[PDB]
Design a protein around this ligand. Sequence first.
Ligand SMILES: NC(=O)c1ccc[n+]([C@@H]2O[C@H](COP(=O)([O-])OP(=O)(O)OC[C@H]3O[C@@H](n4cnc5c(N)ncnc54)[C@H](OP(=O)(O)O)[C@@H]3O)[C@@H](O)[C@H]2O)c1
Ligand SMILES: CC1=C(CC(=O)O)c2cc(F)ccc2/C1=C\c1ccc(S(C)(=O)=O)cc1
Length: 318
Amino acid sequence: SHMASRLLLNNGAKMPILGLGTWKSPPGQVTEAVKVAIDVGYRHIDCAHVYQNENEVGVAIQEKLREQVVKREELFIVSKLWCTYHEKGLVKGACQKTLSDLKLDYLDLYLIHWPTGFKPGKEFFPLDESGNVVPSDTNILDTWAAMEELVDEGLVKAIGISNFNHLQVEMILNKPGLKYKPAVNQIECHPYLTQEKLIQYCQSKGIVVTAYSPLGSPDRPWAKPEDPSLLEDPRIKAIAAKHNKTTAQVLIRFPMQRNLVVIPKSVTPERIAENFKVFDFELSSQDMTTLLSYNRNWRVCALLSCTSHKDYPFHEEF
Ligand SMILES: NC(=O)c1ccc[n+]([C@@H]2O[C@H](COP(=O)([O-])OP(=O)(O)OC[C@H]3O[C@@H](n4cnc5c(N)ncnc54)[C@H](OP(=O)(O)O)[C@@H]3O)[C@@H](O)[C@H]2O)c1
Ligand SMILES: CC1=C(CC(=O)O)c2cc(F)ccc2/C1=C\c1ccc(S(C)(=O)=O)cc1
């Protein structure tokens, strides 16, 4: 299908372009899900402390390492620094908790999960007496410096960002004394949110983009009937049919052909395997342009609770 399995990051390491997502994967199902994924070829798992299932993901990884199904060097494990840990003095510990839960001695990639810092505490979303998120007075540049320290301590091989708009990416690239550039910006991306501007900006700077919610996150907690549905879009099912593939496989192959990394989530063994079988076919330039034409700037993850946060990323056009 003219498609290599990994691409090169600006830290000199290779990253598998297909990973398994784990947001919403129940703790009692995600261990099996990750084991099946590794068994059927996945080498990249996308994690986060905020998903509350890193321990169980770690059990799967550790078992597959112990069983010698895979070597640590062959895995690319990603996690993310949650918003309540943006303070310089909290970053190492947040990373170490993730490392401990995942049962790893390093991460291949650690991302700032959102540009928005929240007040530290037990609550992932600390709210005031009226429901707004309570910000922390941290800024993305000092948070970035804390991330750079993790590289210099051997805890992570690469650092990156997630849900940064192009001006926020630019702020980091123009940071005084910048030591390591972001390797990756992980953003939402699918035919209803195509992200041409932000993707072009990032790629022009050598920053690799990871596409999240590539299937439209049909299991998002806040879904409503009136929402558009990628998996049920007859226009996309048509393209799938033409290629004798599933709609999901087309949705996964789509970002791959844009030089994106993509991380579909499933806890269903049959879908986990199906979703990986996307290196055997090619979307035409016409297919690609047609899928792109479905853009409607529609967001699964809009972080509506934080629209007043100074660093809220989605006021800007891109
Ligand atoms: N950085 C961020 O802020 C951020 C935000 C969102 C997501 N992410 C990452 O990206 C990952 C993927 O995004 P997502 O979880 O939002 O949604 P997604 O991968 O677009 O969709 C997941 C849903 O699609 C279903 N599905 C998977 N394969 C299917 C198939 N072949 N046919 C039909 N349905 C299928 C899954 O069902 P089953 O599981 O029941 O099979 C699940 O309900 C997340 O898990 C997370 O790792 C990151
Ligand atoms: C976009 C989004 C995601 C995906 C991601 O960040 O990976 C997520 C993952 C989680 F585990 C938990 C929450 C969220 C969330 C938004 C969100 C914001 C606020 C609230 S509230 C204020 O009602 O407590 C609930 C959800």
